[PDB]
Amino acid sequence: MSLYLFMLFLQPLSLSFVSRSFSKISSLMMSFATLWSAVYMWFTSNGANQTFYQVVSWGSDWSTFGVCYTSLYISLLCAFIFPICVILVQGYRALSILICIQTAVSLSIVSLHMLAFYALFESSLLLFFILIGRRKYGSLSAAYNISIYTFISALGFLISAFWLNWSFGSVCALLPNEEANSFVAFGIFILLWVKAPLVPFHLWLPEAHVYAPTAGSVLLAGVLLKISIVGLHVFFLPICASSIVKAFPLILSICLGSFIFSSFSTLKQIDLKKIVAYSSISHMAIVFLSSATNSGLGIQGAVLYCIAHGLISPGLFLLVGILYKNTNTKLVFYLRGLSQQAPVWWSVWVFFMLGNLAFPLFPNFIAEVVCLSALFKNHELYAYAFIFFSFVGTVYSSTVLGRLKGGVSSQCVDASRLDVISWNPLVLATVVTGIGYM
Template sequence: MWFLVTSCCGLGTALLTSFPIENLLRYILVLPLFGAFVLCAMPGNAVKLHRVWALAISLITLVLCTSLWASFVPCATEPFQQVIGFSAGWQGLVLVRLEFGIDSLSLWMILLTAALMPLAVLCSWTTQTSHSMSFMALLLLLESCLFGAFTALDLLSFYVLYECSLLPMFLLIGLGGSGPRKVRAAYLLVLYTLVGSLAMLPCMLLMWSQAGSTSFLLLVHENWEPARQLVLWWGLFLAFAVKVPMIPVHLWLPEAHVEASTAGSVLLAGVLLKLGTYGLLRFNLSLFDYANAYYGPLVMCLSLIGLIYASLTTLRQVDFKKLVAYSSVAHMSMVTLALFTMSDLGMIGATFLMLAHGIASPALFLCVGSLYDRSHTKALKYLGGAATAMPLFSIMLFVFSLCNMAMPLTPSFLAEFLCLCSIFAHNGAALFLALIAVVLAAAYSMWAYARVVHGMPKPYAFKALADLNRREFWCFVPLILMTIWLGIKPNAVLDSLSTSITFWHQASLATKETAPATWALALL
């Protein structure tokens, strides 16, 4: 394993010396897709070759993304850098130009995706043997689609890549899932997301008919009429609300997590849910300032309901994996609640919470996967006493349980503190309800940890009780390092995020106080 990591780092360094820095984004977008095509050409029974190739491609991609981050310099006047475009036409009648670029927001989403992909490959190292070629190729294809969605500067290309990310996830649940309802869970994921996206495409076409373009760089300067904003805003919001997910369109998420493999849950919680909040922050909050102020109280009400409801529902779960899934719904509700305070502080805190959740939640799903590989059950009543024979696992679960409940010196603490400060500046009653959810988060995190780690071990569940092996340990090490780094030195993220978010939301701040509020303001 160490030889493979060292070889990939050396190959990544060689690629960096031969490729110009300004073309890094192009190679990052294409490399996972190239790796997926090569995998499909390999023999179907070469299981070890499939795993090694997928891990090598994901590690090289991570090295390229790290180099892209090292060369990125935030600019207050020109947030997007390394903008690349691909043009295609047909007899002068149809002209399509796809634009991709990075700013601070998309850069951190790319880094999160690239960091989680090798972990998804490693945690599937011994479990995915019957469909290893298809499974690993789908992981790389999903990575390429996510890179494209996070960097797309054209609304139609974003829509296509946003929908394309569904197909690999659908097949990953179907191929890698272990539960009897995995096909139903995969169809729930696709149907919920497709129904929400049906409203997004007509709205994008309406924007194209008025502005003559679907380029985000042009649409952000378009003067939309207030009445038209109120219609267009709903089309985008419905699609992103399903992906977040917000109450009441959240029912697909616990089902998908329970039936998916560990790798599927890691990517679903770590990255795919962030597509919804990324879309809200990138498009809704940047394009429709009047509609944001008009519908903002309604979204905050829905977020508060989802925050309290998901926290209480998490407390009564008896399945460890479903407990972590419902906690994700609660944390993402906190993100949307802070986003629609429409303040710079709230948006920066919400984005940082997205990154913190993208570290803690995949780590907890890795813990669930490690337990399931040994005991073949996720029911909490059959788990217990892990500290007696699994001390290393117990330490990992303890650290990430603290991160999930937002203890100081973890990134979740600072992220939730920034979110709560923005909520307090907006509305005191909303802060009171959010604080109740914070207390509930501590309750269900410690309750689950105590049920799994303490007490008497259950010999009928743990027939071969063993601590983390070397491969599982190295899955946790990067997440531990990122947690410590972001918890102690959050300025590495916050400084760059503030530059991009402040640039894009000046207009929203200027019109927030003058736009009328909806009836939902009375509920706050």
Template sequence: MSDWPLLSLVTFLPLLGAAIILVIRGDGEVVIRNARSVALWTSGVTFLLSLFLVAGFDPTQPGFQFVERAQWLPGLGIEYHMGIDGISLWFIPLSALLTVLVVVGSWYSVEHRVKEYMVAFLVMDSLMIGVFCALDMVLFYVFFEAILIPMYLIIGIWGGPRRIYASFKFFLYTLAGSVLFLIAVLAIYLETGTTDLAVLQSAEIPLSMQYWLWIAMFAAFAVKVPMWPFHTWLPDAHVEAPTGGSVLLAGVLLKLGGYGFLRFSVPMLPEASAYFAPFVFALSAIAVVYTSLVALVQQDMKKLIAYSSVAHMGLVTIGCFTPNALGIQGSVVQMLSHGVVSAALFMVVGVVYDRIHSREIARYGGLADRMPIYAVIFLFFSMASVGLPGTSGFVGEVMVIVGVFQVNSWVAAFAATGMILGAAYMLWLYRRVIFGTITRDDLKSIKDLRWNEMVAFAPLVFLTLWLGIYPVFFTRPMEPAVAHLIQQTQTVDTAAVADE
């Protein structure tokens, strides 16, 4: 398959599946059954194709692989340019896998406008993968912005009682930041005459211009992560989104900010990144401590996990601006781990919400008696979120903390408090929901996990253990790309000092 345009196939196959679902006609039950089947087959084949990318990837090469080029806007010199390196490699199968699990997990729980629901998630799948494959800034921006549309619809149509408010807040926050990113893209194009990322990573952008470009990009990526204090849209979006929307929002969309820092800010604007690194460290340290404390007082399960996501992504932003390989690799591993573990935790909440239609922690208690398999799954992912050794959460957090300790021990200390506070709020949540005595009649008849829910959790359990026990499988392909990234920034820094 080496001659196949694999990246284009993986990127646009979900769109083909969405188009097929749109033309399905027939009785209500027939349409629903066919829509689910097409969505499952399309997302499944997309995931299998993404595994061919992993199998064919050369872990010794730092450059972009599976590169595809085609004329797009020839008058402007803008191309359809796709490719992946070790930093972007793992996000493609992660996006594809989570889409499969969303389809499987919602097999029985979603009954309203099922056809449109599957179309929205397949379009999301295509756009998410496109972001991580794009090697042209304009192409990246198209995918980056277009993701807002299906997620806006997913929250606004299938969300909770305050879904309209949450969807508008999500859209406006992220759009505001992205407008500044578009201005930065135009400024870079006018300065360098190109939007090709492979060229721009070695381009010399004037130092005075770097500061303004960095601020513009920071506005876009900080909202996506989201960093404190730009995080206020996230709890509302998570609480009101359906389970599938929360899975992709936490599992993939929050990673776009961290990926943007590593793909744009750090390599293209190295002096500005070094200058603003203390600012990022300060905001990230506040995020880790503050949002963990806020999570401790939450009464809504989804809101608690949403605030925990802000805390965990604070570690990611610390790692992104740590000027050593350990910190940067740790940030990528932490993004992968959070993508798996947080997606699983939102699925855990979704299981009981589908049965009881409540996310209030006080509404539950004693579920271990009626849902023993569920209790084990919940415990496993709670421990992974805390950072228990042997799980993926431990590897990413330790790599980031050790990496940043070499730069600033105070930042490392604040980052480490996240693990302590994380244990506090996750154990408190688990105790309240799982242990105790069942007092409500509806909980006495609650059913344990269905087959489709167990199928959805199984690969996430496997990945959490695999990344926790044998992380070198995931870090080895990214080592050359990270080393090349650090070498680029050091070379540019040295050249700047020589010019002075």
């Protein structure tokens, strides 16, 4: 734990002292070293310690950091996917922004204090406002959308944290507190409602993904959407269970509506990144609802399905970024004959699209089975509703694949050696998790 935190603090530190020509190499080495430190944290985490594997405090309640089942999975996932982001991004400015964002996000996951969680997570507010609103390829509207949505939801969460700190005297997770108030429960809930894109607060995610860089999109999809489940398991369910059980019909209404309308909105997309971004929104609802059941199956299934999403959607975003570099287009209608023109890119694209459709040899299958089993434990109709409307995803995925597959094209647009190096780890991890090493 201490080694992981030290390395997380070391990565932004190194950029200040590097030569500004060695920045990429030093950043890549630092990212791999942080991954190794995360593996060490996993090694030193004994399953005998059932509640929390590790807890460290550095002199205050705010400096209390700890790893649990959800935290450990999410932290390993972010440390796994960061190096790919590092290689995809060029320039000292971009490297600095992405390193600071990753440091803040990775410190948020292991934090055990709601106020420190808020402080670390929202520190990356301007960095995305600048990142998504970059000079030539960015849009100011999307940056405004994401920044305002995050600010309002996080401020509601902050108000609830202040009320808890006033009443209980503490806001740390390790101190058992329960509240039945609905205002505080909604204050904590609204952040989850916005951060995990859930209709009708999902509008920020699409505009952000399309106008963010490929490394930015990879991080956003990979771990920033998963921060919702760390907040839910760590800071909402322990204290706000009475409210989630009181509002369960409403929770199901909103979750299933998000699933259905996000699936239907995906059908109206002509941009590849928008297609992947809307697939993410439909995928988040099952996670949110499975956790909300507050059962052993639901929590495990949600964290598993988060890992599956954080291995599948970064791959699709990376492949789309590679294709956009090769073609300078993201419109499906311009892109044809990709099967003949890019056999190696097409194979991986089809593999990852099959993963997104939750086919058996992929982690999404196991994760979906567990989540659907939890929903079936609550009620049969709950699982039946989700299982049927999964067919909408097949329609748009198949239409996109058919449009890209064949036609007449005069351009060889296939990936280079650097690109294949970029996705090889994701493919290997996807296979390893798919065979059951979840």
